[PDB]
Amino acid sequence: QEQHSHLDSLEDQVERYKQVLDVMPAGVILLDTQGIVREANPEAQRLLDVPLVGEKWYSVIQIAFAPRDDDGHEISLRNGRKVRLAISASTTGQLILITDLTETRLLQSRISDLQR
Amino acid sequence: QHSHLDSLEDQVERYKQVLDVMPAGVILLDTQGIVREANPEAQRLLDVPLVGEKWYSVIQIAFAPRDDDGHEISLRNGRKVRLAISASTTGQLILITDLTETRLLQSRISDLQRL
Numbered sequence: 001q002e003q004h005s006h007l008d009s010l011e012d013q014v015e016r017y018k019q020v021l022d023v024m025p026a027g028v029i030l031l032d033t034q035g036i037v038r039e040a041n042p043e044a045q046r047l048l049d050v051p052l053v054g055e056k057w058y059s060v061i062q063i064a065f066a067p068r069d070d071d072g073h074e075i076s077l078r079n080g081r082k083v084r085l086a087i088s089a090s091t092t093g094q095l096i097l098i099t100d101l102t103e104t105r106l107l108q109s110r111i112s113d114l115q116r
Numbered sequence: 117q118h119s120h121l122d123s124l125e126d127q128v129e130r131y132k133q134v135l136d137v138m139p140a141g142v143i144l145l146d147t148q149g150i151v152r153e154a155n156p157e158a159q160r161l162l163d164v165p166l167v168g169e170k171w172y173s174v175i176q177i178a179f180a181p182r183d184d185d186g187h188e189i190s191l192r193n194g195r196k197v198r199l200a201i202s203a204s205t206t207g208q209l210i211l212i213t214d215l216t217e218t219r220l221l222q223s224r225i226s227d228l229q230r231l
Contacts, residue, residue: 004207005152006152006206006207007146010124015206016144016204016206016209017131017134018131020134020142023200024140025200025213028134032118032119033117038119039120088133088137090120090133091129092118092120092122092126092130093118095130095134095137097134097138097139099139107225111228114228115228
């Protein structure tokens with residue numbers, strides 16, 4: 001009857017954290033210190049829909065985003081989704097969290113239009 | 117020049133940062149269903165003592181189900197959240213996304229289409 005924990009070892013720690021990245025409902029772009037995507041989680045890969053790993057983040061910005069005048073706190077993608085970017089610095093590069101706010105943005109529009 | 121994949125140790129390091137700043141709660145159970153780790157959003161959303169606690173204990177004080185909860189479940193503090201539970205090799209993972217605003221915006225809409 002053996003008992004286990006993700007904190008049992010470093011090797012187990014990474015295993016669990018990987019799983020988290022894999023299934024979290026937000027995109028995660030990890031850059032190295034030269035601003036090249038060295039890892040992207042499934043949600044990131046889905047929202048952006050372009051090659052990520054190995055590309056310069058600035059390249060990706062030119063292909064994957066399509067900023068419209070009415071973006072405000074978020075930024076628009078090719079497919080027209082509106083997403084929020086949480087950009088942080090890393091010991092070994094940069095982290096970019098990507099959360100989809102399309103639906104939330106639609107609900108608020110709907111509300112404004114229905115108030116007329 | 118550096119990368120988060122330069123070593124096992126750099127790798128955990130970057131993943132910890134992700135958990136820490138994630139706009140979603142993350143609850144990590146061991147195989148006895150004890151909360152072994154809990155990120156700040158989880159700690160914030162649920163707002164009860166988490167680490168070192170039986171999850172089934174936490175469930176009894178953090179949540180307060182309401183009949184209209186639907187795909188979400190309510191916290192005792194009034195928030196409506198969505199759980200995404202999955203099995204881990206070494207226990208369980210719970211993702212908690214806050215749907216309070218969405219539900220509110222949705223309710224406001226339901227109220228306006230009845231006028």
